[PDB]
């Protein structure tokens, strides 16, 4: 079957879109080469539509069946419940796309009569009708990147397919509790979303250490969502139904599967019939959970089919890392080819063929890699980092165009120990917050497919909780990091690190002069910037932080909110 069929109708935008980074003295102080920064628009939607449209064949085998049997057995130990309407409403992000039925996220979150009565009607209809396909909207995402002329032109916009807001709330009532219990039961420690950045590093270090002679690879499936077949999606349902659930939950889950998850008609923003989907919807609740389970099953089966020796996996949606015992250079290459052939049979063909690596730091997963620096007392300290180009480009965009989602804050939190966060992002944004005089304002950001709300003044505590006090004392960064970061800054026309250091001294001093939590930020976040460093003591606030909802599977399109 084809992943999509199309009518010829265009994928259209809601509002006018901005393609180019606007000139502005605040964003210019971060980076000058504004012509290199672009935002994807609906102008490139047809190009993407072509890429994600292809035939899927799927041939399963004994290895696949064996893994699937184990998974269903594991799921049978899980008990899940429905969420109340009110619980599901509270999980809706404040800027989630409004319903076509006369209400938005604000109404849902405040439980307005129209929103509530509508959602009740949608729920009842889910229970009564397991058959009629539920309409979805297809939209081009607006995401910011830096040009890469060594890799062709600009990336085409990603596409997102999602149902109406009323349906999205119903998905949470039916399936949210499952998203919070099932992945850990069936994938155990291989499930990546349960780990903070520091824990992810610890997991990978352990996995690597376990092997007498470790070899690792990442596997890139070509357009994973499009490779997911109707059978795959019905199999996911079978796994959900293996849980102990109330009958009403079983009914809603089945209707959602047949009417929404397995496929259905897509409409553009103008309401014209755009096409029909026969693969994974990118913007439904189960997108992340479904991708993770389906990727785990196919990958583990492919390991068995290939004869990979003692595999330890880390799976986050379509993102897959496999660490195992090396069988020798040529044997490893051969076995990776056999793994790829198996994944291909299972309908998960590769983008770039996997490459064996024999050093953990050389494996890229979820766009990140492990690096090492020194903490206080000169101990080696491993931490997660990434190339800063995209985070810098988005930070410049977000400096001049305010967005409901602050990617820069998510980056500061996730990549706090990195030299680029500490010297550049932290310095720039605390500067900008004082310029705006909005330091003490909660901001939203996306992390692991979920939306969170954080006050920047709480960052020392948050950073301490997630990364430890060492995140404020790290030094002697790797040659690779210094080189990669300096090169990104030059490429974007940003000031060099030495300039950021002088800037941070003044930001630090300004924050300290404001006293209170602002002074705590100055002292902790910018201790690296002064010659006479302060002694940083554990923050009592770090322990009081309720991070119980951090680091879990999220939702397609990040359409879930925790506060």
Curated annotation (Swiss-Prot):
As for what it does, the entry says: RNA-dependent RNA polymerase that performs primer-template recognition and RNA synthesis during viral replication. Initiates RNA transcription/replication at a flavin adenine dinucleotide (FAD), resulting in a 5'- FAD cap on viral RNAs. In this way, recognition of viral 5' RNA by host pattern recognition receptors can be bypassed, thereby evading activation of antiviral pathways.
What is said about its interaction partners and assembly?
A: Homooligomer. Interacts with non-structural protein 5A. Interacts with host VAPB. Interacts with host PRK2/PKN2. Interacts with host HNRNPA1 and SEPT6; these interactions facilitate the viral replication. Part of the replication complex composed of NS2, NS3, NS4A, NS4B, NS5A and the RNA-directed RNA polymerase embedded in an ER-derived membranous web.
List required co-factors.
Mg(2+)
- Shown residues in whole-protein numbering: 2443 to 3005 of 3033
> According to its UniProt record, how is this protein modified after translation?
The N-terminus is phosphorylated by host PRK2/PKN2.
- Listed name of the protein: RNA-directed RNA polymerase
Entry's cofactor comment? Binds 2 magnesium ion that constitute a dinuclear catalytic metal center.
Instruction: Enumerate the spans annotated as RdRp catalytic domain.
Output: 214-332
Residues annotated as binding Mg(2+) 2 are: 220, 318-319
Q: Where in the cell is it found?
A: Host cytoplasm; Host endoplasmic reticulum membrane
Catalytic reactions on record: RNA(n) + a ribonucleoside 5'-triphosphate = RNA(n+1) + diphosphate
Q: How is its activity regulated?
A: Activity is up-regulated by PRK2/PKN2-mediated phosphorylation.
Q: How does it sit in the membrane?
A: Single-pass type IV membrane protein
């Amino acid at each position: 079957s084809m992943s999509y069929s199309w009518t010829g109708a265009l994928i259209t935008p809601c509002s006018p879109e901005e393609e180019k980074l606007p000139i502005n003295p605040l964003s210019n102080s971060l980076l000058r080469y504004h012509n290199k920064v672009y935002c994807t628009t609906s102008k490139s939607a047809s190009q993407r539509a072509k890429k994600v449209t292809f035939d899927r064949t799927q041939v399963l085998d004994a290895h696949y069946d064996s893994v699937l049997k184990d998974i269903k057995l594991a799921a049978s130990k899980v008990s899940a419940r429905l969420l109340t309407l009110e619980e599901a409403c509270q999980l809706t992000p404040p800027h989630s796309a409004r319903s076509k039925y006369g209400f938005g996220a604000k109404e849902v979150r405040s439980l307005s009569g129209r929103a509530v009565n509508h959602i009740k009607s949608v729920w009842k209809d889910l229970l009564e009708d397991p058959q009629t396909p539920i309409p979805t909207t297809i939209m081009a995402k607006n995401e910011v990147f830096c040009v890469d002329p060594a890799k062709g032109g600009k990336k085409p916009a990603r596409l997102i397919v999602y149902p109406d807001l009323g349906v999205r709330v119903c998905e949470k009532m039916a399936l949210y509790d499952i998203t919070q219990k099932l992945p850990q039961a069936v994938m155990g420690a291989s499930y990546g979303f349960q780990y903070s950045p520091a824990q992810r590093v610890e997991y990978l270090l352990k996995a690597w250490a376990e092997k007498k002679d470790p070899m690792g690879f990442s596997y890139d499936t070509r357009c994973f969502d499009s490779t997911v077949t109707e059978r795959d999606i019905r199999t996911e349902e079978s796994i959900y139904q293996a849980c102990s659930l109330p009958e009403e939950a079983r009914t809603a889950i089945h209707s959602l599967t047949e009417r929404l998850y397995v496929g259905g008609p897509m409409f553009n923003s103008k309401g014209q019939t755009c096409g029909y989907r026969r693969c994974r919807a990118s913007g439904v609740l189960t997108t992340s959970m479904g991708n993770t389970i389906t990727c785990y099953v196919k990958a583990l089966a492919a390991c068995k089919a290939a004869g990979i020796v003692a595999p330890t996996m880390l799976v986050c949606g379509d993102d897959l890392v496999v660490i195992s015992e090396s069988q020798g250079t040529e044997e490893d290459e051969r076995n990776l080819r056999a793994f790829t052939e198996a994944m291909t049979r299972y309908s998960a063909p590769p983008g770039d063929p996997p490459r064996p690596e024999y050093d953990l730091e050389l494996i890229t997963s979820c766009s990140s890699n492990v690096s090492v620096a020194l903490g206080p007392r000169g101990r080696r300290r491993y931490y997660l980092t990434r190339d800063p180009t995209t985070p810098l480009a988005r930070a410049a965009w977000e400096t001049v165009r305010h967005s409901p989602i602050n990617s820069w804050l998510g980056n500061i939190i996730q990549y706090a120990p990195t030299i680029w966060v500490r010297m550049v992002l932290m310095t720039h944004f605390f500067s900008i917050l004082m310029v705006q005089d909005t330091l003490d304002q909660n901001l939203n950001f996306e992390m692991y497919g979920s939306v969170y709300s954080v006050n920047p003044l709480d960052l020392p505590a948050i950073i301490e909780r997630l990364h430890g006090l060492d995140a404020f004392s790290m030094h002697t960064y790797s040659h690779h990091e210094l080189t990669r970061v300096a090169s990104a800054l030059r490429k974007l026309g940003a000031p060099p690190l030495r300039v950021w250091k002088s800037r941070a001294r003044a930001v630090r001093a300004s924050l300290i002069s404001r006293g209170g939590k602002a002074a705590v930020c100055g002292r902790y976040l910018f201790n690296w910037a002064v010659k006479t460093k302060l002694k940083l003591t554990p923050l009592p606030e770090a322990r009081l932080l309720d991070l119980s909802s951090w680091f879990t599977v999220g939702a397609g399109g990040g359409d879930i909110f925790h506060s």
